[PDB]
Write a protein that binds this ligand. Structure first.
Ligand SMILES: Cc1ncc(Cn2c(=O)c3cc(S(=O)(=O)NC4(C)CC4)ccc3n(C)c2=O)s1
Length: 506
């Protein structure tokens, strides 16, 4: 039994090798650049632009904790930033000290926020010497980088709001200062359950990571402290780009004359290790990062924990609409892990060996595309639901302006499976069709399912040998719904056997 099938992986396009030299990095109407481009040098910490803190407290930018507008009622408006500095600049020796410090500027949640997982991690999971290193070295270093925020993030950060096509390029050092603030729960207006302003934004403050007794919380905390220990000990020097992409024009799928592209399908390997230099898919929730700052521990959350710079997308990325995606370039891997969901464990620190492009960004491109949640199995075969998934994957794969020869393969796998109720064989065909329309090859990981690997390979080879276009395949999907799903009240025949019969008997 072969471990992979199709086009050899060596024949598939990878980056920065197959991806043209970059244009000059510069701020523009659609691109926020928070560093001095003229001073950007390999191995040097980037200098913030502007030199002095500039504040914007409005509906179009992140509300910074260091803003002079970040006020609290005193029994007279007091400075919340001054209160945060006072609270955090105390020695911590016991977990209660950290809980009490966080609650000093979060008084309204002193009875709502549970800190059980944080207390248990520090007291009941860590050995004495590990606890000592956490409160004597890691936590004070995290406070210092959090409190440096006005000197590090000097430029207002725009919100990547619904329907905006915009990019933010910032330094990994800027991201570390922002994530240390999210750990200490300092972002204002991001907490109320009945908030309106940020109701369509994911949670950013880390308070839900400290709650309850799940055995997976110590693993999430080890993963995040591994990152914080690394970035406070030695300031990272690269940049990271966050791009919100929203397409107006979608293909008329039934009329698409494009042929299928190449396929490498395997039941072994992972997107992050075997998909190096390729567009890597994040099986996202519509609120990017899903339950990373709370209970979730599946594909998306794991990637967000091992590449924590992805977490900051939650500060400024509004919930994704059907025609949108988020593309993140440059995030670094700080941890290695084993397992998944209830078996997930942090293994050790990871030294990322990825090369950097001309903007000092690690050569790792990740796209967040959220699959639909199907209440009933048969719902996904509804043409509107199929067209939705095709358009979502297509938006994640398309790079408008870029030529096909400069596009890496897509490294993906069973998107929206299990809990979301997605049929793996249909979702594989949808991704294959979207990648074909976007003119990219596919590297598909089946995560131990050898039978699924064979089925996808046999279907792909059957359609390609018969020269079936994207349109031809899409029409077969429409026929399956009409013959087996529309009139079905209980399907009698599976999708792939239907397609094989429909094509072989026509
Ligand atoms: C047959 C199945 N289809 C889906 C399943 C769920 N699943 C995954 O989705 C999965 C995804 C990856 S990965 O390559 O995407 N890497 C990250 C986790 C992002 C870092 C690695 C392991 C996985 N494992 C074990 C798993 O069980 S199992």
């Amino acid at each position: 039994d072969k471990k992979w099938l199709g086009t050899p992986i060596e024949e598939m396009r990878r980056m920065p090798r197959c991806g043209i030299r970059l244009p000059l990095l510069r701020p523009s109407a659609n691109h926020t650049v928070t560093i001095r481009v003229d001073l950007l040098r390999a191995g040097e910490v980037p200098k913030p632009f502007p030199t002095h803190y500039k504040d914007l407290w409005d509906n179009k930018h992140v509300k910074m904790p260091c803003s002079e507008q970040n006020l609290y009622p005193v029994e007279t408006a007091g400075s919340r930033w001054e209160l945060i500095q006072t609270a955090l600049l105390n020695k911590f020796t016991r977990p209660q000290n950290l809980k009490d410090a966080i609650l000093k500027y979060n008084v309204a949640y002193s009875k709502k926020w549970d800190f059980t997982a944080l207390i248990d991690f520090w007291d009941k999971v860590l050995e004495e010497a590990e606890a000592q290193h956490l409160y004597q070295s890691i936590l004070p270093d995290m406070v210092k980088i959090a409190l440096c925020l006005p000197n590090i993030c000097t430029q207002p950060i725009p919100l990547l709001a619904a329907a905006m096509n915009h990019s933010i390029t910032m330094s990994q050092e800027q991201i570390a200062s922002l994530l240390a603030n999210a750990f200490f729960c300092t972002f204002p207006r991001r907490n109320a359950k009945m908030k309106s302003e940020y109701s369509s934004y994911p949670d950013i403050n880390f308070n839900r990571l400290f709650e309850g007794r799940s055995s997976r919380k110590p693993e999430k905390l080890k993963t995040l402290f591994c990152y914080f220990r690394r970035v406070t000990a030695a300031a990272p020097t690269g940049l990271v780009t966050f791009t919100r992409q929203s397409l107006e024009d979608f293909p008329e799928w039934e009329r698409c004359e494009k042929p299928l592209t190449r396929l490498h399908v395997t039941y072994e390997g992972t997107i992050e290790e075997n998909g190096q230099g390729m567009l890597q898919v994040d099986f996202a929730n519509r609120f990017v990062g899903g339950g990373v700052t709370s209970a979730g521990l599946v594909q998306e959350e794991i990637r967000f924990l091992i590449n924590p710079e992805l977490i900051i997308s939650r500060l400024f990325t509004e919930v994704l609409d059907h025609n949108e995606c988020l593309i993140i370039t440059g995030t670094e891997q700080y941890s290695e892990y084993t397992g998944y969901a209830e078996t997930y464990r942090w293994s050790r620190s990871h030294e990322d060996g990825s090369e950097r492009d001309d903007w000092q960004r690690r050569c790792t491109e990740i796209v967040a595309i959220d699959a639909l949640h199907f209440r009933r199995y048969l719902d996904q075969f509804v043409p509107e639901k199929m067209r939705r998934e095709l358009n979502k994957a297509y938006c994640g794969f398309l790079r408008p302006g870029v030529s096909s020869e400069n596009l890496s393969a897509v490294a993906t796998g069973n998107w929206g499976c299990g809990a979301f109720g997605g049929d793996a064989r249909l979702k594989a065909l949808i991704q294959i069709l979207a990648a074909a329309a976007a003119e990219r090859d596919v590297v598909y990981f089946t995560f131990g399912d050898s039978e699924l690997m064979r089925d996808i390979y046999s279907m792909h080879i059957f359609l390609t040998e018969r020269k079936l276009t994207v349109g031809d395949v899409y029409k077969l999907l429409l026929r399956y719904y009409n013959e087996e799903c529309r009139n079905c009240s209980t399907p009698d025949i599976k999708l792939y056997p239907f397609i094989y019969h429909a094509v072989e008997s026509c």
